[PDB]
Structure formats: structure tokens, C-alpha cells
Design a protein around this ligand. Structure first.
Ligand code: BGC
Ligand code: BR
Ligand code: BR
Ligand code: BR
Ligand code: BR
Length: 715
């Protein structure tokens, strides 16, 4: 009634104003948002009591300006582990807590909609934004997104899942035509969004930059209307990615309700002011007022529940200390232990020789709209210092002096904002021999960063180790093994890198990802064993880049892609490696622990409507720890080709003490068993295999059930 009331009072022009952003705030000619640094604002209409609503990034935490002009107050935010690390936790409960924490900050800093989470599929490891997406798998991705959204929206503010859909590379994202079969769309790319939309009901969806099978996502009626609304029952509103598309009236007709950030002419000379174009379209009858009304109603039905609509007095003082704890917990459960040949955790008071410039230039997250401005960011060295761990104080100072010396030089000083990659092999072969005799263990930091706007390359220094990095590892490993001592590598990265070439040279490998402000503290605590690694890969680590099935990336022509075809189709990530027998370096769902777990007591039952899978996990080791279990279903070959297996459920146990067990009970609706044959979702009759694994390739328990009657579901 409120909506219909306001809507009936709005003039034609006011309605048009409402469906377009007010321009990128604080840039070009534009005024700062009332929340300085916010990504966008809507047009206010005081006439009928409508305020401007505020939208802000992002996935790693709220991104706003830490300071303001003529202002003595602080506006620092919490910088959380990046999404790929959050996904590595495989912990829904925890994702919800992260959402609540962020949501509280969103609310109290005067923001109405958080531009998160990002949930595009990891099609290819080279995508520059992989760090801020969850997984190569739609179920993990959708489930983690759902938990996050619920946490955010329990705080009276809105989330926004992005980017819908198939935004799986950065190269020419604003222009590239993405060619994908409807099957790959429904099973892989749409699927995570479908799960999120139905389970967590986000206030909003952001349409992607790219074209999908010939049409901009922001101008795609099939995507935004037929699928999103008519099929899925989406009740929120759709906004465009910033400056996406080329036609404002086509956007509204397609079901893209809110055009952001507005004033596209400020960035692209060939674009008209969208308000003027829309007004003209209405005058000439290219656009009906009824279409406009529906778009306005979609926005208002959501935003009348926003804090700004009720003049909420935000405090500007969220409980950061409480949020820092949540950030720590998230990073703690998201570290992945990839290798441990009796190397971790480190013995108490062990003398550590810390290597790698990344020990100091620790990467807390990726760059772009998903960046953050925390009050502090604890480097790996600082974290070890803080915990009072025994390290080579001499060596640390040497590193500190070397970095400062390098960042001063013309070649390695920061330009425009990039930091040239520093040489890592600046130690003499004899110098390191010294370290091997003096210290007990070696710990090597390998760092990578990436970000919005750029894809990674399959070359040394990016996907592959640089020669200097390889030489460092080779020398450190030889010298320390010489002394009978262990060497550990910490992977401070945002997406997979080559590991096969060097992994057999070291004893321990900790995938530390990029863990936000608390990184150093998490890393130190993992090293000592205060934290028992419970993370598992949400993405496949290929032996070599050439093994990756999404070979068409980044499209054609390579240097300036106008199109990219998803030739691998549904066979992306582990679906490919399992189905066609290609062995990964480390598989989807892989992760080690400082303790051991035994799986037992499998019971599988199916009542025609629900698949029920039960089993027990016991801690059979000597240290407390959590275990992530994964339920894969292998469908019968039947009528249509299908992947070897597909993740359908997953679970993470409580913190189990030695000897403790927990009974796991997971239910899977029959519909989730379907494959899409191009027309309909079909659950084929026949025998299905239930595979309960500690990873996609470490199946602990197997059972079968049967579907007696074929089930069909029309979209
Ligand atoms: O900053 C607003 C938006 O900018 C765009 O370039 C990104 O693709 C979005 O993820 C972001 O929310
Ligand atoms: Br996607
Ligand atoms: Br290994
Ligand atoms: Br990276
Ligand atoms: Br192609």
C-alpha cells in the first residue's frame, strides 16, 4: 500500500529520475555521497517523502572513505578475508556471521545496499576477480552466498548478488559476447544465483557488464525477466553494473530497474544523459509508462524497507573490535593446508628464518571496487612478532632494509597504483647456508595480487613462479634439508598458481590466501598450531595451465576479444577433471588437518522426494579440529551425458576434541538431482551413487539409492 501510494503520487519525470543513479559520487563534476566514497546514490524526491538511498561496495568489507574534509571523525571499516578464502571455510554458519558483521557496519555508516556478494563461477584460474568469487562449483557458491546474504539482511540493510551472469573474465568485460549453451547456463552459471535468489531473497541483483549470447545482461529480457522473475520468483530489483550496457530504454524493458551509476556521458562521450533519453522515449512511445511503473515499483517495494526511508539515525560507530574477531575466525577457518610432511605445526620456540618480501608486503586482498581501507593490516612478519615467536631478528631487519631500498629505486617504486614485483633471490648461496645453521626451520612467503579490470597471464611471476622465486626455494630447501631441517611455504595468493614443479622440494605448504586486516595474526596462530587448519579448496589447482578445460579464455581475437565461447560447457572445474581423467595438482575440496578423522555409519534413504544422507565423523587424532565433508552424487548414464559426479551437499563439523564424534544429517530435495536436457530439468530413473568425501577424490563412504520414477520440471 505504501508503494502504491507513493507511486500514484509520482509525476512522470520523478519516476524517470528514480530509475537512474545520480552519477558517480565525488568524481567528475559530481558531489560526494552523504557517505563519502559510496559507489552510488538514487535520486531523492522530497515531494512525496523519498530520500536518496546509498549503495556501496563491497565483497571484502564496506568500502567508503576513511576520512572526510572538515571532519575530525574516523570512518574505518573491517577488511575481511577475500571470498575465495571465505569459500575455503565451507562453513555456512560462519559466512552468516561475516554477513552480520559487515551488515552492522553498512547500517551504522548510513548505507542502504551493500554491493555484495560477488558469486560468478571460477571458470578459469586466470580471471582477475577470482579472489572475490567463491568457487568453480554452483552449489558451494550458491550456499555460501545465501548464508552471507542472510547475515547482511538480518541487519535491516540489503545485499546485492553479482554479477548476473557469466562474468567470468575481465578482458573486455564491457564488450565481450559470451557464448554459452542453455544447459551450461542452467547447471553451472545461473545455478548459484538461482540457489541464492530462492534461499536468501537478496534485495537486489546486479546485471553483468558482458553480453550473453548476443545481448547485454543489463538488456537481456530472457535473463532478467523470464528466468529471474517468471521462473525463479525474484521479488527484489535489478541494478546495472556501473556504466554497463548501451541503451537505457532497452535496460528498463528488459527488467533492469535501476541504471547505475548514472550520467554515463561523463565516462563515454557517445552516451546521452539517460534521463533525457528515457524522457524522449516516453514522449515518442518507444517506452510505455506501465513498464516504467513496474521498474519504479520493483525498486520502491524493496527500498521502503531501507533505513534511509525511515530516517534512521546511524551512529557512525560500528563495533569494529567485535568485527575484527569475526574477521579472524573467518580467516582461521579458510586457510588451506596443502602439504605437511611432519612439518607443522612448528615446535614451540623454534627459530624461524622468514623468507620472501611478502612477509612484509603481505597481500590482504585484491584491488578494485572490492578493495578496503582498514585502520591497520597485520603483515606476516608483524603477526609473528606480535605472538612473540622466535624468528631471525637479523634476517627480518635485512628484509626490511632491502624492501625500503628497492621501493626507493626508479624501477621498483610504485607508479600508476601498481608495485613492480620485487626480486626475491637477493641472498647469496653462502648467506642462506648461514641461516640454515642458525635457525631451526625455514618459512617462505610467496605473494600474488590481482584485481578488477585485469586478467592474469599464464607466465612466470603470475600463474608460474618467477625464476628468482624458484631459485630461492631450491636453495633454501637444499640448505635446510642439508641440516636436516624442514622448509615451509606460505601461499599468500588470490587464485591458483603452479605448484607441481616445486612442491616436492618443501615439507609444508599453507595456502594463506589473502586474509584481510588480521592476516598476520591468523598465519602466526596457524603456524604454532593454535589454529588447526580446517579449510578446503573451493577451486581446482591444475598441474599446468594447459590442463585447464576453459581453453578459449579470454576469447577471440585474443588481443582484443569480441567473443568467447564456453566450449567446455558444463565440464568446468572438477566436472572436467573427473569426467575425462585429467589429474589436478590439488583437487576441488582438498585440504589437510593437524589431526585425523574417521568416517563411518553411512545411511542412505530416498522417499521419492528427499534424499537423506547420514554418517558419523570422529576425531581420531591428538588435536582438536573441524572436518569438512562433501557429498557427491554420481547419476546414472541413462539418456544424456553428465559429469562423473556433482557436489550436492556439504557439512562442517563443530570443533571436535580428540575422541569426539558428530552425526551428520544432510537432506537433498529430488529436484536438485536433475540435469537440464536443453528444454527441461530431468531426474532420470535408475541407480545413483552417494559418495561422501574428504575431497572430490578422497571418497570415504559409498552407498546407492534408486529413483523409480522419472521426474520432469519445466523452467
Ligand atoms: O563500484 C561499483 C561497481 O563497479 C564495477 O566496476 C564492478 O564491476 C562492481 O562489482 C562494483 O560494485
Ligand atoms: Br557466473
Ligand atoms: Br603435496
Ligand atoms: Br592472485
Ligand atoms: Br572463443
Amino acid at each position: 500500500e505504501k508503494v502504491n501510494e507513493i507511486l500514484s503520487q509520482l509525476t512522470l519525470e520523478e519516476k524517470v529520475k528514480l530509475v537512474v543513479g545520480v552519477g558517480l559520487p565525488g568524481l567528475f563534476g559530481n558531489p560526494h555521497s552523504r557517505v563519502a566514497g559510496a559507489a552510488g546514490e538514487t535520486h531523492p524526491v522530497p515531494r512525496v517523502g523519498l530520500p536518496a538511498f546509498v549503495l556501496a561496495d563491497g565483497p571484502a568489507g564496506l568500502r567508503i572513505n576513511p576520512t572526510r574534509e572538515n571532519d575530525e571523525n574516523t570512518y574505518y571499516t573491517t577488511a575481511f578475508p577475500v571470498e575465495i578464502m571465505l569459500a575455503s571455510t565451507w562453513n555456512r554458519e560462519l559466512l552468516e556471521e561475516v554477513g552480520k558483521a559487515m551488515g552492522e557496519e553498512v547500517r551504522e555508516y548510513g548505507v542502504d545496499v551493500l554491493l555484495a556478494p560477488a558469486m560468478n563461477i571460477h571458470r578459469n584460474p586466470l580471471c582477475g576477480r577470482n579472489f572475490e568469487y567463491y568457487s568453480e562449483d554452483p552449489v558451494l557458491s550458491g550456499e555460501m552466498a545465501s548464508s552471507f546474504v542472510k547475515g547482511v539482511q538480518s541487519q535491516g540493510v540489503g545485499a546485492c548478488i553479482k554479477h548476473f551472469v557469466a562474468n567470468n573474465q575481465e578482458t573486455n568485460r564491457m564488450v565481450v559476447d559470451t557464448i554459452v549453451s542453455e544447459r551450461a547456463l542452467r547447471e553451472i552459471y545461473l545455478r548459484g544465483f538461482e540457489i541464492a535468489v530462492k534461499k536468501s531473497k537478496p534485495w537486489s541483483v546486479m546485471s553483468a557488464y558482458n553480453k550473453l549470447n548476443g545481448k547485454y545482461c543489463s538488456q537481456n529480457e530472457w535473463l532478467l525477466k523470464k528466468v529471474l522473475r517468471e521462473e525463479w520468483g525474484f521479488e527484489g530489483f535489478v541494478m546495472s553494473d556501473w556504466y554497463a550496457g548501451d541503451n537505457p530504454v532497452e535496460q528498463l524493458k528488459a527488467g533492469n530497474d535501476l541504471i547505475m551509476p548514472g550520467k554515463a556521458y561523463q565516462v563515454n562521450t557517445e552516451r546521452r544523459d539517460e534521463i533525457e533519453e528515457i524522457m524522449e522515449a516516453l514522449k515518442e512511445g518507444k517506452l510505455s509508462e506501465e513498464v516504467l511503473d513496474e521498474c519504479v515499483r520493483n525498486i520502491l517495494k524493496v527500498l521502503v524497507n531501507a533505513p534511509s526511508f525511515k530516517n534512521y539515525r546511524y551512529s557512525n560507530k560500528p563495533d569494529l573490535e567485535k568485527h575484527a574477531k569475526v574477521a579472524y575466525e573467518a580467516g582461521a577457518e579458510g586457510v588451506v593446508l596443502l602439504r605437511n610432511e611432519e612439518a607443522l605445526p612448528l615446535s614451540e620456540n623454534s627459530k624461524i628464518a622468514l623468507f620472501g618480501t611478502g612477509q612484509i608486503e603481505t597481500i590482504k586482498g585484491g584491488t578494485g571496487s572490492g578493495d578496503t581501507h582498514p585502520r591497520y593490516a597485520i603483515s606476516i612478519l608483524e603477526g609473528i612478532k606480535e605472538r612473540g615467536l622466535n624468528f631471525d631478528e637479523e634476517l627480518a631487519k635485512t628484509y626490511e632494509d632491502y624492501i625500503k631500498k628497492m621501493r626507493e629505486t626508479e624501477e621498483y617504486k610504485p607508479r600508476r597504483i601498481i608495485k613492480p614485483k620485487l626480486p626475491e633471490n637477493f641472498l647469496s648461496e653462502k648467506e642462506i647456508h648461514k641461516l640454515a645453521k642458525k635457525n631451526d626451520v625455514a618459512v617462505i612467503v610467496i605473494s600474488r595480487i590481482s584485481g578488477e579490470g585485469y586478467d592474469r597471464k599464464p607466465v612466470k611471476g603470475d600463474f608460474y613462479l618467477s625464476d628468482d622465486e624458484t631459485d630461492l626455494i631450491k636453495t633454501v630447501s637444499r640448505e635446510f634439508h642439508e641440516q636436516g631441517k624442514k622448509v615451509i611455504v606460505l601461499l599468500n595468493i588470490g587464485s591458483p598458481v603452479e605448484v607441481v614443479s616445486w612442491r616436492d622440494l618443501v615439507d609444508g605448504i599453507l595456502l594463506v590466501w589473502q586474509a584481510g586486516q588480521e592476516t598476520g595474526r591468523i598465519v602466526a596462530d596457524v603456524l604454532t598450531g593454535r589454529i588447526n587448519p580446517s579449510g578446503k579448496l573451493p577451486t581446482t589447482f591444475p598441474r599446468d595451465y594447459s590442463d585447464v578445460p576453459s581453453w578459449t579464455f579470454p576469447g577471440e581475437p585474443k588481443d582484443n576479444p569480441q567473443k568467447v565461447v564456453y566450449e567446455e560447457d558444463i565440464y568446468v572445474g572438477y566436472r572436467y577433471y573427473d569426467t575425462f581423467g585429467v589429474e589436478p595438482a590439488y583437487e576441488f575440496g582438498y585440504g589437510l588437518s593437524y589431526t585425523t578423522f574417521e568416517y563411518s555409519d553411512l545411511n542412505v534413504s530416498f522417499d521419492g522426494e528427499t534424499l537423506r544422507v547420514q554418517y558419523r565423523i570422529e576425531n581420531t587424532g591428538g588435536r582438536a579440529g573441524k572436518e569438512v565433508s562433501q557429498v557427491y552424487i554420481k547419476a546414472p548414464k541413462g539418456k544424456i551425458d553428465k559429469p562423473f559426479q556433482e557436489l550436492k551437499a556439504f557439512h562442517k563439523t563443530r570443533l571436535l576434541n580428540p575422541g569426539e564424534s558428530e552425526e551428520v544429517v544432510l537432506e537433498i530435495p529430488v529436484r536438485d538431482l536433475a540435469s537440464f536436457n536443453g528444454e527441461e530439468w530431468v531426474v532420470e530413473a535408475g541407480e545413483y551413487e552417494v559418495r561422501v568425501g574428504a575431497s572430490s577424490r578422497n571418497i570415504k563412504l559409498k552407498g546407492t539409492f534408486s529413483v523409480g520414477e522419472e521426474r520432469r520440471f519445466k523452467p
